[PDB]
Design a protein around this ligand. Structure first.
Ligand SMILES: *[C@@H]1O[C@H](CO)[C@@H](O)[C@H](O)[C@H]1NC(C)=O
Length: 375
């Protein structure tokens, strides 16, 4: 019963040349769920973010025609979106409920299998309560619709932060765990171009020399914080990045964890964002001349540097290491950000979709089983 939820980013279709990704590029057998990101709120109603999206919806659905057990979800929100439309969505009950009732129709019309809520992020007591009510209402209406109609219930999932501080700030974990089908923990973006020291995007474990605060910025500590706060393991989907985060070094001779950095490193040719690289862009950086590939034995993740360019990322080995940690802890499955940034063309020299394949094969035979695991 382990689940693999893969995000598909709409804007990946705007990629140039090989980087261009369409719903048809998705292997219908890789993931258990596909989540399309993002839809938006216009007049407090679940709505297309762009007319080009309507047909995109039609194409991400009907991946079901090559795999009928594949579930397709639509995500609302995201970072660009902001926290304000969610505050106004949950300000009064009518708009809230009318949002739910019409969202159900919207989803059923497109024949989605459910909804992913990406409010990034609720903050403060009033936001906490409103996030719970939104989730509660969606869940009860999904159940209620499943009985007043005829078909199996729409799925409810949400993307949630890894930061232990953001958890306390915005998430009543026992309550949201009642109504969510899956809790997608964003166990990445622990470090990046907003910092002036080199650090890894998604380290599994911390360095022994790390401060007590730095030790909390890991996949292992974050996932366990969610458990500690009451999230049920079988609903916890641990996030796996198919991308890396890069730095421009102050000094070429200092390339170790914590070396000074002036900002993000040179953008990739396809994602066009400094401080950021997709995995197939990582490989291009890796086969350049004189690039040093390093394996961090403590953090159990790779990184690489060449001249003043430094990038920390995830490969086959780190993701396999993570699946072993996953099974050991007994989590319900994984979430992948994102399917369009795996090497979906096989240009790395390994197989097509190498990162997700490596995770899938390592989860083979795994079945989630709940058991007491101490304080
Ligand atoms: C780079 O680092 C070394 C010591 O690690 C320092 O002596 C050197 O001056 C630095 N380079 C520059 C241009 O400052």
């Amino acid at each position: 019963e382990p689940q693999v939820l893969c995000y598909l980013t709409s804007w990946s279709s705007k990629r140039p040349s090989a980087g261009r990704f369409m719903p048809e590029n998705v292997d219908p057998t890789l993931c258990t769920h596909v989540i399309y990101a993002f839809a938006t709120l216009k007049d407090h109603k679940l709505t297309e973010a762009d007319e080009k999206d309507a047909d995109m919806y039609d194409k991400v659905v009907a991946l079901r025609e090559k795999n009928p057990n594949l579930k397709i979800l639509l995500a609302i929100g995201g970072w660009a979106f902001g926290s304000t439309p969610f505050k106004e969505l949950t300000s009064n009950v009518f708009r809230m409920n009318q949002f739910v009732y019409e969202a159900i129709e919207f989803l059923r019309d497109y024949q989605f299998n459910g909804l992913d809520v990406d409010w990034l992020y609720p903050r403060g007591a009033d936001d906490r309560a409103a996030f719970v009510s939104l989730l509660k209402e969606l869940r009860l209406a999904f159940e209620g619709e499943a009985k007043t109609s005829g078909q199996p219930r729409l799925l409810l999932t949400a993307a949630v932060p890894a930061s232990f501080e953001a958890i306390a700030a915005g998430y009543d974990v026992p309550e949201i765990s009642k109504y969510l089908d899956f809790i997608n923990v964003m166990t990445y973006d622990f470090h990046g171009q907003w910092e002036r020291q080199v650090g890894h995007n998604s380290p599994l474990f911390p360095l022994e020399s790390a401060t007590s605060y730095q030790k909390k910025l890991t996949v292992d500590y974050s996932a366990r914080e969610w458990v500690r706060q009451g999230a049920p393991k079988e609903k916890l989907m641990i996030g796996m990045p198919t991308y890396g985060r890069s730095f421009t070094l102050i000094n070429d001779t200092q390339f170790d964890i914590g070396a000074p950095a002036s900002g993000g490193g040179q953008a990739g040719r396809f994602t066009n964002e400094a401080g950021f690289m997709s995995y197939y862009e990582i490989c291009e950086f890796l086969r350049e001349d004189n690039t040093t590939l390093v394996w961090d034995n403590e953090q159990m993740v790779p990184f690489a540097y060449r001249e003043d360019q430094w990038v920390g990322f995830d490969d086959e080995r780190s993701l396999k290491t993570k699946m072993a940690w996953l099974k050991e802890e007994g989590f319900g499955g994984i979430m992948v950000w994102s399917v369009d940034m795996d090497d979906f063309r096989g240009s790395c020299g390994t197989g097509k979709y190498p990162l997700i394949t490596a995770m899938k094969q390592e989860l083979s035979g795994y079945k989630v089983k709940l058991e007491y695991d101490g304080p």
